[PDB]
Write an enzyme that holds these catalytic residues in place. Sequence first.
Site, PDB file in Angstrom:
ATOM      1  N   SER A 140       4.036  -8.413  10.412  1.00 15.37           N
ATOM      2  CA  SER A 140       3.023  -8.783  11.388  1.00 15.37           C
ATOM      3  C   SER A 140       2.206  -9.946  10.851  1.00 15.37           C
ATOM      4  O   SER A 140       2.095 -10.149   9.640  1.00 15.37           O
ATOM      5  CB  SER A 140       2.110  -7.601  11.733  1.00 15.37           C
ATOM      6  OG  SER A 140       2.827  -6.588  12.414  1.00 15.37           O
ATOM      7  N   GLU A 146       0.833  -1.195   0.000  1.00 15.90           N
ATOM      8  CA  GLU A 146       0.000   0.000   0.000  1.00 15.90           C
ATOM      9  C   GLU A 146       0.869   1.246   0.000  1.00 15.90           C
ATOM     10  O   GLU A 146       1.721   1.404   0.887  1.00 15.90           O
ATOM     11  CB  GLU A 146      -0.925   0.006   1.214  1.00 15.90           C
ATOM     12  CG  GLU A 146      -0.268  -0.446   2.506  1.00 15.90           C
ATOM     13  CD  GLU A 146      -1.257  -0.585   3.646  1.00 15.90           C
ATOM     14  OE1 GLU A 146      -2.430  -0.193   3.469  1.00 15.90           O
ATOM     15  OE2 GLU A 146      -0.863  -1.088   4.720  1.00 15.90           O
ATOM     16  N   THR A 182      -0.165  -8.117   4.016  1.00 18.18           N
ATOM     17  CA  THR A 182       1.123  -7.810   3.406  1.00 18.18           C
ATOM     18  C   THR A 182       2.253  -8.483   4.170  1.00 18.18           C
ATOM     19  O   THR A 182       2.949  -9.360   3.637  1.00 18.18           O
ATOM     20  CB  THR A 182       1.332  -6.294   3.366  1.00 18.18           C
ATOM     21  OG1 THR A 182       0.295  -5.684   2.586  1.00 18.18           O
ATOM     22  CG2 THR A 182       2.689  -5.956   2.771  1.00 18.18           C
ATOM     23  N   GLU A 226      26.114 -15.691  19.084  1.00 19.02           N
ATOM     24  CA  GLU A 226      26.460 -16.168  20.418  1.00 19.02           C
ATOM     25  C   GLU A 226      25.227 -16.587  21.210  1.00 19.02           C
ATOM     26  O   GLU A 226      25.223 -17.646  21.848  1.00 19.02           O
ATOM     27  CB  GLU A 226      27.242 -15.087  21.163  1.00 19.02           C
ATOM     28  CG  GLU A 226      27.573 -15.422  22.604  1.00 19.02           C
ATOM     29  CD  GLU A 226      28.617 -14.490  23.184  1.00 19.02           C
ATOM     30  OE1 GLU A 226      29.183 -13.689  22.412  1.00 19.02           O
ATOM     31  OE2 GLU A 226      28.862 -14.550  24.406  1.00 19.02           O
ATOM     32  N   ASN A 260      -0.271  -6.925  21.880  1.00 11.40           N
ATOM     33  CA  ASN A 260      -0.530  -5.559  22.311  1.00 11.40           C
ATOM     34  C   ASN A 260      -1.260  -5.471  23.640  1.00 11.40           C
ATOM     35  O   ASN A 260      -1.158  -4.439  24.311  1.00 11.40           O
ATOM     36  CB  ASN A 260      -1.350  -4.810  21.249  1.00 11.40           C
ATOM     37  CG  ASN A 260      -0.746  -4.920  19.863  1.00 11.40           C
ATOM     38  OD1 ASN A 260       0.166  -4.172  19.510  1.00 11.40           O
ATOM     39  ND2 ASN A 260      -1.253  -5.854  19.069  1.00 11.40           N
ATOM     40  N   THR A 270      -7.859  -6.730  16.209  1.00  4.42           N
ATOM     41  CA  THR A 270      -8.155  -5.659  15.269  1.00  4.42           C
ATOM     42  C   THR A 270      -9.092  -6.107  14.154  1.00  4.42           C
ATOM     43  O   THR A 270     -10.085  -5.434  13.869  1.00  4.42           O
ATOM     44  CB  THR A 270      -6.854  -5.115  14.669  1.00  4.42           C
ATOM     45  OG1 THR A 270      -6.190  -6.157  13.944  1.00  4.42           O
ATOM     46  CG2 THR A 270      -5.936  -4.606  15.768  1.00  4.42           C
TER      47      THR A 270
END
Lengths: 158, 182, 432, 439, 439
Positions: free
Chosen positions: D140, D71, D145, D254, D206, D179
Amino acid sequence: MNEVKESLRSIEQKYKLFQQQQFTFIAALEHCRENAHDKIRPISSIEQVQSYMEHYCNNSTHRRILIMFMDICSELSKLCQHFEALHSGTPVTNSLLEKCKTLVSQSNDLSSLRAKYPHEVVNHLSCDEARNHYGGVVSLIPIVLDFMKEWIAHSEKL
Amino acid sequence: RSSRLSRSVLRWLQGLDLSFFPRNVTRDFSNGYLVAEIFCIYYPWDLRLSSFENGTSLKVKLDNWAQIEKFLAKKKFKLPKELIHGTIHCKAGVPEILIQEIYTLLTHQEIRSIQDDLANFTDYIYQMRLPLVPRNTVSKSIKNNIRLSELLSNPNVLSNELKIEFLILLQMLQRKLSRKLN
Amino acid sequence: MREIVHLQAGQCGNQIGAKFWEVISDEHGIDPTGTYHGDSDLQLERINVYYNEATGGKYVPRAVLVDLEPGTMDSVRSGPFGQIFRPDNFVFGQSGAGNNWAKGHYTEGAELVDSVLDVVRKEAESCDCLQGFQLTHSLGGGTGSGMGTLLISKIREEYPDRIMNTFSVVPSPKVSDTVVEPYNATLSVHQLVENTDETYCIDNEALYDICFRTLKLTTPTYGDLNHLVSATMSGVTTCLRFPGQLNADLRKLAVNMVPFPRLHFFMPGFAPLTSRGSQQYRALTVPELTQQMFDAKNMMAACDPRHGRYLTVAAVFRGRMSMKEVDEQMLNVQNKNSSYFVEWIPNNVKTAVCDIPPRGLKMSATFIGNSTAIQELFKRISEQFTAMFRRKAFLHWYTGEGMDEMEFTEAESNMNDLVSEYQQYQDATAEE
Amino acid sequence: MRECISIHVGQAGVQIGNACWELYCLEHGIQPDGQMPSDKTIGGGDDSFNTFFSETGAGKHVPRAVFVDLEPTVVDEVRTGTYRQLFHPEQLITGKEDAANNYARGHYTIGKEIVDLVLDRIRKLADLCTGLQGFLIFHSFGGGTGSGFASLLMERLSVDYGKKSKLEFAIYPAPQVSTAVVEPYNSILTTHTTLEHSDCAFMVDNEAIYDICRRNLDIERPTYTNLNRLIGQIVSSITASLRFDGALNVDLTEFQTNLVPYPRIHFPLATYAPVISAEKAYHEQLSVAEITNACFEPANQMVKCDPRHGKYMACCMLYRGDVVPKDVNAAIATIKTKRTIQFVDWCPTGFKVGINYQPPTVVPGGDLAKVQRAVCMLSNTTAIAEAWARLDHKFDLMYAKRAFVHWYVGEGMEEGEFSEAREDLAALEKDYEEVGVDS
Amino acid sequence: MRECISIHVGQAGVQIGNACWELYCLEHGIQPDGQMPSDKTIGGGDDSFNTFFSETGAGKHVPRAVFVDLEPTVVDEVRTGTYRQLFHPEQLITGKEDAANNYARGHYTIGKEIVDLVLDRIRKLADLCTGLQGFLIFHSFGGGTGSGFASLLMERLSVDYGKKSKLEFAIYPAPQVSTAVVEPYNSILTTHTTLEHSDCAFMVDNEAIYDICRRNLDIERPTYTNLNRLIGQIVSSITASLRFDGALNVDLTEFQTNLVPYPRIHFPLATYAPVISAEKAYHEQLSVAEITNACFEPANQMVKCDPRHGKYMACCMLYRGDVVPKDVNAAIATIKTKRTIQFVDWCPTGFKVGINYQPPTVVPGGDLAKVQRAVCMLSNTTAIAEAWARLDHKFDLMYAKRAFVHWYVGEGMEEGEFSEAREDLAALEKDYEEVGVDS
């Protein structure tokens, strides 16, 4: 004070440009001497130079390099007169200024004026040219520039 | 105790008076100093052991092995180039096989070899035989079949990616089969 | 002449080596520039042991720094004495260790080891004759432990007639730094008992406890531990660095100090560990030094030697005291404390006094003993390794590199044999 | 040397990358213009900046990151910002059509159109660098996307570079709040790709951010800026020994080597501390023992899960600021004897010691105060497996009647992939249960 | 007396000659004007400069060298330099057309046109000299000017002067890196001529120069100037006892007589030492044993070849600077007992002792520092024959399908020459292995 330094760096720049075209300058000088029927007496005076550029000259680049050299001499003269207008200074500064105003004379003998290390203007030409054809015409500006640097260095510690 | 070399092969390996016994068959023979010593022992007038250095450098291994195939071509000995390449990069199971063929060529004694040609290079069969279905990741298979040594030796992105996707397809098909077994 | 070539490995090894170099430079009068600013006598004759003669008398260090990460060289070069070493010796790679022994031995120990072999061979050829090679490192990582064993094996195979002494850092279950630390320790122990002359035990937790309960430091850090180990090294090496009356060398100790090659571990220790406010209130004498050198409070061990019996003991002194007091003290100790050393072998203490006192301190002496105390560390290492091996946790990382699992099996078999040997020599009875 | 390339997919990835870059520039004194105009009063900046930035012949810094989004609105929003003179427009690729919370379109009909461009860009970026260790892929699970494009790209990246570490940082949908609705649809497909094709993955939500900010920072009206600041602080703390040094440096390799006990179990629990505001950092003495103890508190955990339900297999701790080893030793001695903390009968101990001399800095206008030291914890426990259990339950209940599946069918994709993902997740949960079970 | 004439063909030859002349003038204090203008502060120059220069009646020095090139661009480039007042223009012969990596034109249609001029020039130069020992022909195998013209001139010089030594110095085409493509085509024809009509030949390359400079000098940006400086230092070290004297003077004949074991084997291995920068010459104690041992190291060798592959037959060793005979004897005793160094079972020893009281000098603006003594070694071994083997392999794989041969065919030359050169090289190799085979 900065104006004289800017003028001096411009003088150094046009000087550097001159030796980058010193070969063409000497070629033009030889052409002028051949066209003037004077191939015996070395060029050791500015007056001979503008006499050749104003009378015995046909190539536009030749008169261009000659007028650039004349502008070089005029800028040296203007810097000298600005320095004399600045202040007197110590007697050594006065001597440097005097020898420089003498060296920038239109009618002055330059046959016994030669440059030395680190100035390579002599080494770029054959030894014969530097002795009895073109020895003071090329070995004038670097030496005057050195005197300018010395005079500025002396004036700066006053 | 899984030195894959046969008892007779080890009994002849000891029988050559090598400077040091190979404690790790895979690593020690990767240099080629031991096999060069062996060939000098068999053919003293054709190879010079002084010309070979016992080091761990990839370049030294390459040069020692290079003198080796030059000698083999002079002697017209038939050994797989893939076998030699796997030995140089100390691939699992390769040096034991190579020593077996060296013994067969020199002593002219046939062995009841468990496996002659290319074997199961990866550990797919081994992992399947293990409980707790491993299903090793793509990175694990890459590290197992692709090492840093051969990447340094010969780089070719196209062939590398072709082999990578081939192995990935093999893994996916085997995963489908394993899910069928469930 | 008789010189010693020093080796470096591991970030902790690198830092302790740098600390030791700074300490010896300060003690022997070496400026950070590289010239000589000393005012002593014996600091010019035998100074070529750790230095090399050059024009302008500018001595250079003799040590090769081996590492896999470029992030240690910058740290050590920026120090007050980091501009004096040889940049050519700082051989570092492009990929880090990540606390893995196997891959560091395999991946980062194939194309990088050639340069360090070349430089150490050049250094050895540069001198006329040598005695041995000193390598300081730690077992906490794949840098020190991964390559120290390999380089020691290489030098032993090349030059078998040399002294292989090392001061690796043993782990501690209470104070850990690596999840896979027992694996690396088990892997290193095999090479230590197979391809190493002698090895000394180094613990950080014990030095911690010592400095807190005796030195009483406000904010002690790794710098203090590096200083202590550097002082211990200098006290060990002063027998050859600064000759006195009864001089000794590393090989005589290693021969006289080790009954069997399979057990070459020792117990270092320094006596005058006092607080700042106590420095002005102390009586400098024999019995005090003997008491601090015999008791369990001052050693640098995370264990107890009172659980076993003393096998071999060497007491190296550095000062101008005597000979009679040392022998009478050891005599009355062996008489009184009879249930603490082997009765089968009398006179287990070696006398050694360096007539040359150290710089900055008038009285110094070190303790090099081999008491029956590492058995607990060994058995707990064996127990924890058997644990982390039974269900094979954190093993896919080692597997993916190429190396198999039978190495762990042989290592644990060797470790079980070693601990059984140690425990059955512990009760060294006279007869049936 | 220790240099890495960051990947930012989706709006969340882009904003997180912007926050990370601004944090790096403020912490390293890097001016937004791209040069060093500080010719009168210096305020720092004499450090090793080559890890993230690059030095030109004219004294300029070029960020090394990938800002891609289907987008163009996010690209335009960032481009009109005050930092537009820092990066280069070639690194911000726009797009005609966007996924916007869908996997099928952004994985087949949209993402497959822009492939050669991003591959060429990342290849050039890698060529501009000398040493490469790992990548920072920011995306995410909710964003279509950052799910479809992220998966399709990372597949090619892992096949193209098998010797390079592959990290993962995205947002895990909270079971309570969310969401969108089709979030688990994309999640069930992205988890398979992140599991069978990557080396490590970091899951965050969240709801925990909201809880911790209201409990400690005490804000009634939070915003995404604080969330991004927390994420950037976590990222900086993780890669702290790379830009700087310390007593015991801990590189990406490491800690990544020990953080993965199994190829199928590479899902650590991140926890930053101290997460406090200005007034919560003045009259509160801060030591190491208390914050390390607070690190294991569920209230401070980044994921909503009770640690006491399961137990720990591998633990990775990090530190940043003026820390003293004795305090760490005392904390280790305290926690190894705590009966509340559960652990297997198998790992008596395991951790690292990362000492960083450079203290964390602050930002003018932020909520974080000046703290002398910081600590970040990366642990591995089976108690977090409930989240995948809830996700599988949700997928099963929404898959029985095939809700919102005809869209994916029409786009073009195999319906059996749902069953494949379901069985793979079930096998993963079974394996996690088996590992969590001791002898 | 000991006077020699140098021949410079091609751009590489001309630049090498310029480097050698400038090194000679700086080391002997010869001023660029050609006179002795130092009338205030003397800085040397009272020596036997007659070896290379010539003294006029006016106190002038005239270089005795031949600067010929088919392309006028190099002649112009030198002519516009700062030393144009030193030499004479008649010695620099320009050209209309140039070979430029082509043998046929420069050997038949280009080189044959300028013959009488260069022959008259060299005849006059020889007449100007009293004692002649050998020649310094500087050319290249890659350059067509330095191959065809060089071959055609040396063939005539061989038949015109049989009692004079004929040296050879040029660049070998490295198999790893190269400048052009047709390098083997010119090299295969030039090797036959240099073998069957010359007495000795020195083969050097550029890759090993790059390796040694990057390893010791530690320069990320090398340049041809350093290469020319190295070559000039080698040349000066070789001809050190000619301009000066010492405890044991080794003339050109003195070393070339033993340097040639067989008429077919005259390819020594040159190695200059020490090759170090300024910082590499300050905190590094330099003795004779260490440098002599380093001289046998393959890393310091000019030709990339493992000495351990073959063994040595003849060796020529030289020294320059303050060297003590005891150090030389100790080094000889050390190396004679070294097991790594291999040698034939018939030559227990062979070497020379060249003591030069004059140490090597430095240059303002160069990389070489002030070293008290130098060393150069010239050994003969069979391990270098692999380069001819690789060249023959390349020429064979190039000649099967006749790549870029039609040009040479059209120019005018026999195709059977390629077969002749191939069989001659095969025979020479076979001789090399036969000699390398002991009893």
